[PDB]
Amino acid sequence: ADAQRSHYTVYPEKRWELYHQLHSHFHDQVDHIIDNIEADLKAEISDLLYSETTQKRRCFNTIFLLGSDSTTKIELKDESSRYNVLIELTPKESPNVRMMLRRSMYKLYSAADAEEHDVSYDLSLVENFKRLFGKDLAMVFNFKDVDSINFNTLDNFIILLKSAFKYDHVKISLIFNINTNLSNIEKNLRQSTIRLLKRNYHKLDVSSNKGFKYGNQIFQSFLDTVDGKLNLSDRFVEFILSKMANNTNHNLQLLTKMLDYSLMSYFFQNAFSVFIDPVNVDFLNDDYLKILSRCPTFMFFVEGLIKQHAPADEILSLLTNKNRGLEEFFVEFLVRENPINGHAKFVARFLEEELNITNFNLIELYHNLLIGKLDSYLDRWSACKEYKDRLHFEPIDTIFQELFTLDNRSGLLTQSIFPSYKSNIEDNLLSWEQVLPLSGDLDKIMAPVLGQLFKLYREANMTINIYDFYIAFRETLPKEEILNFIRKDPSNTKLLELAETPDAFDKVALILFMQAIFAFENMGLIKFQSTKSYDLVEKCVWRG
């Protein structure tokens, strides 16, 4: 009723608590690491912004922050008897030379009155700032996304700032937050201005992924938060190797996402999650005792039991013939610490400072541990050759770990996080039987509306004719069902006069065809080439 008006508002667990004591505790380790790099980035700009006393003293100091994410915020020193202001210029606010000046002079001016306790918004204020506001000026220019701007505007901008170098009560500082590709930037500008730039440049790198000093760190703080109460399987962690390698800019926010979603999967379906604290042994039930039986390492050890002990009268008794000894057989292996966690923490600090190696990934270090490829892991520096015997660990085939583990053995978080998008749509439209289970008898003898043309839509050419496609569409519809369908309702009258018309079938097809190809434009599957002609269209969607 109201849906054509836009944005109308209206004003209409024993398991989960053990998640709640684990989740936030992990997240205290997350954000405390997040402010560490936040304090790191804010520090290394601040000292380098100051103490650089050049001899010519007629040049601005420039700073190239390579690899930076265009969101790096900056704080400034107080530095009394001089105001220090920050101006940010987003490529959305870069239309010309003119408004790049005019908005920027406006942005400092309100920042100037707020600390001060009619004028014109150009460089007139810059010289008279000594008289307009008393103390001197040191402005800084947070160019947020520098490679999207037309550089001749930027090149003409910096010559305008070059004229401000003759007043001696103002200091200029430029911050170039590039995304990447410093060699691209010295190509675009005028070479007369690069020689203006090259007085005191500083190529500080700011990257979230820099030698994995935080990537290996945040996975390490993940491991102790789940220490001894779970495991991480091999097929799980290689997914974390492969998919996180596909995102260069921000691994660290992504590793929080795919790990915490993985932990959300475990608490939501696994019944033995309650038993990670041994105080919960009183919650034991036969239904819990029944579902413990189908563990693969459980039944395999029983196959190991019979072949080792060909007397099986003991093994048959400890089966479901007893239940007290049966769970006592389980809680024998309950407290398995699995020191692969601790052995990782043993070797992680070692090569960090004993051999002092930094170009390493702790996750595949954990993964090569899971197969036994730690020997073929340390080889890539040839520096643990004196230490491959003391850092050695053979991964033991541990038992009952399949109840306390995380793995994408179901393809869940492969699907629900990285969905094969146009694959799952195209699979939905060719098949349609595994999505959908008086008038439903028609449905068992006639396809749904969107999908029935789709099989011929595959079987059509690159650019297709509209009418012959409908002519082919009329072939798929048999005649007797529609007149059985159009005459199904005796209650309505306005439909029934159309129902008795002898050309109703050929009219109801073009009505139904012009509801489906009407609905293949908002999906972008078919594009109407050369409007006001629309005799032929173009299909972009291919199967792959």
Partner: protein, 135 residues
């Protein structure tokens, strides 16, 4: 002597982008010379090196991308991720204004990277490109 024969005004990157995005770049350079009349014959599943680049459309990328990748891949969510990642790097830009380019109206695309940075990034992923450029 050493300073008097060099300029020393330039303050060649191996580029930061990932592997599937690297092959995403290596398919985009192909339509600087490969016209639609020739490409589907020479890239079956069964010179303008100097000249200014031609104009893309969408899905011609994935036409070439699916061919030249090492059935081994089908999920294209991260492939769609690195496109607008490459759009923010201004290495492939829109012909029109920078606004409506998402929904498939008439939007043409084009590379903005010279040949040498393509040539290093070909060997950086061990892929051979100079075969398919033939005057």
């Amino acid at each position: 002597i050493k300073l008097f024969l060099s300029t020393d005004d330039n303050l060649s990157q191996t580029y930061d982008l990932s592997i599937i995005s690297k092959y995403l770049l290596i398919a985009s350079y192909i339509c600087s010379y490969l016209e639609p009349r020739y490409d589907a014959s020479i890239f079956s599943r069964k010179n303008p090196r100097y000249l200014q680049p031609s104009l893309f459309a969408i899905e011609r990328l994935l036409a070439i991308f699916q061919a030249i990748f090492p059935s081994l891949m089908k999920a294209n969510i991260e492939v769609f991720q690195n496109l607008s990642e490459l759009h923010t790097l201004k290495l492939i830009a829109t012909t029109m204004n920078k606004n409506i380019d998402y929904l498939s109206p008439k939007v043409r695309w084009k590379v903005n990277v010279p040949w040498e940075i393509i040539k290093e990034i070909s060997e950086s992923v061990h892929f051979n490109i100079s075969d398919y450029f033939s005057d």
